[PDB]
Design a protein around this nucleic acid. Structure first.
Ligand SMILES: O=c1ccn([C@H]2C[C@H](O)[C@@H](COP(=O)(O)NP(=O)(O)OP(=O)(O)O)O2)c(=O)[nH]1
Ligand SMILES: [Cl-]
Ligand SMILES: [Cl-]
Ligand SMILES: [Mg+2]
Ligand SMILES: [Mg+2]
Ligand code: NA
Ligand code: NA
Length: 326
DNA sequence: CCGACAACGCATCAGC
DNA sequence: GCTGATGCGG
DNA sequence: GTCGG
């Protein structure tokens, strides 16, 4: 955070282009700059110095100089004052509400937490739960609580079927001291890229996590991706732990490494590694990495037996989870 | 210049 | 009912 | 908004 001031500015600029401008690319460009500048081991003294880092162009360069001079960005000072932009930005903070639904509500005149509350009949299921746990979801999860949640999830899963393998990924696997949520990659021998010999593999687990009252709500649930809520149990007289977001992804066992790579992130690391991958002539997703013929069509899945194998194909020196926090 | 920008599961809608 | 486009995730 | 060709 040697440049915490600069990277926050870019993030705010990025959330704006995304929520208000619905200009996803500017959003991604800004996040990239914030990212590269964030790992830069020096306290940036000027736009020029920043323009050197890849991802930082001329526009961002000027903003950084202005920011270093005045201590703020005019363009942001204005954005903060515009009521429409502040409403949209706010609503989007509710899980389930994005740029579109956010702008839609404002038109209707629904632009404050009070409004959403007295208009629950105008939200889909996810949005409703996102409203219910509005505060909680804004709270980070201390690694210790993560470790505690991990035990429940792994033990409960072990109970449903000893052959289930549950690995906690996301920022937890990258070793963060706090996480925005808990991410769980789940595999079982019956579900392989070749065949699904057992149905409801994800359902059963979710069902077990519910019986023990660990999982309390469901944002969305399909055969391989579950999006919901959970809560650590509290002791007698102890004030309750906040409700936490939980993501569970069922992946074919033979595709574990591509799956764990992806789910370990970060999102920006994935974006960059996948981008590079293409440049090297490959395509990478949560399931496999494949080659690319001039035509464009992906080829057949290359053999993978470790995360490193994936790094090797693209000719990138392996990077432990802790170093993928971009 | 200017196209490209990672990738995909689920919820929900339009159109048939 | 389906298929496809869009939103959201994030 | 930035980038490589
Ligand atoms: O846009 C995305 C989002 C997530 N992911 C992957 C990487 C990320 O680490 C993982 C889990 O998603 P989260 O949104 O939970 N992010 P993460 O766990 O890294 O951080 P946080 O602590 O905020 O949850 O899914 C992507 O590839 N693209
Ligand atoms: Cl854009
Ligand atoms: Cl695939
Ligand atoms: Mg996470
Ligand atoms: Mg998550
Ligand atoms: Na640059
Ligand atoms: Na939101």
């Amino acid at each position: 955070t040697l440049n915490g001031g600069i990277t926050d500015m870019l993030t705010e600029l990025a959330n704006f282009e995304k929520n208000v401008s619905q200009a996803i690319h500017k959003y991604n460009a800004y996040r990239k700059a914030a990212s590269v500048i964030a790992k830069y081991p020096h306290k940036i003294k000027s736009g020029a110095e920043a323009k050197k880092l890849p991802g930082v162009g001329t526009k961002i360069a000027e903003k950084i100089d202005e920011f270093l001079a005045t201590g703020k960005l005019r363009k942001l000072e204005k954005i903060r004052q515009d009521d429409t932009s502040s409403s949209i930005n706010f609503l989007t903070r509710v899980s389930g509400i994005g740029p579109s639904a956010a702008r839609k509500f404002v038109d209707e005149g629904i632009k404050t937490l009070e409004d959403l509350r007295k208009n629950e009949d105008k939200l889909n299921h996810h949005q409703r739960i996102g409203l219910k746990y509005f505060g909680d979801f804004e709270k980070r999860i201390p690694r210790e609580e993560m470790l505690q949640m991990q035990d429940i999830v792994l033990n409960e899963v072990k109970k449903v079927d000893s052959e289930y393998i549950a690995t906690v990924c996301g920022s937890f696997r990258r070793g963060a001291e706090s996480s925005g949520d808990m991410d769980v990659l789940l595999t079982h021998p019956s579900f392989t890229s070749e065949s699904t010999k057992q149905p409801k593999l994800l359902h059963q687990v979710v069902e077990q996590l519910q019986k023990v009252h660990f999982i309390t709500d469901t944002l969305s649930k399909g055969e391989t991706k579950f999006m919901g809520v959970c809560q650590l149990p509290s002791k007698n007289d102890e004030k309750e732990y906040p409700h936490r977001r939980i993501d569970i992804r069922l992946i074919p066992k033979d595709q574990y490494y591509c799956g764990v790579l992806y789910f370990t992130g970060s999102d920006i690391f994935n974006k960059n590694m996948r981008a590079h991958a293409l440049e090297k002539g490959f395509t990478i997703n949560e399931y496999t990495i494949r080659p690319l013929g001039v035509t464009g069509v992906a080829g057949e899945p290359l053999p993978v037996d470790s995360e490193k194998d994936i790094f090797d194909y693209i000719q990138w020196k392996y990077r432990e989870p802790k170093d993928r926090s971009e």
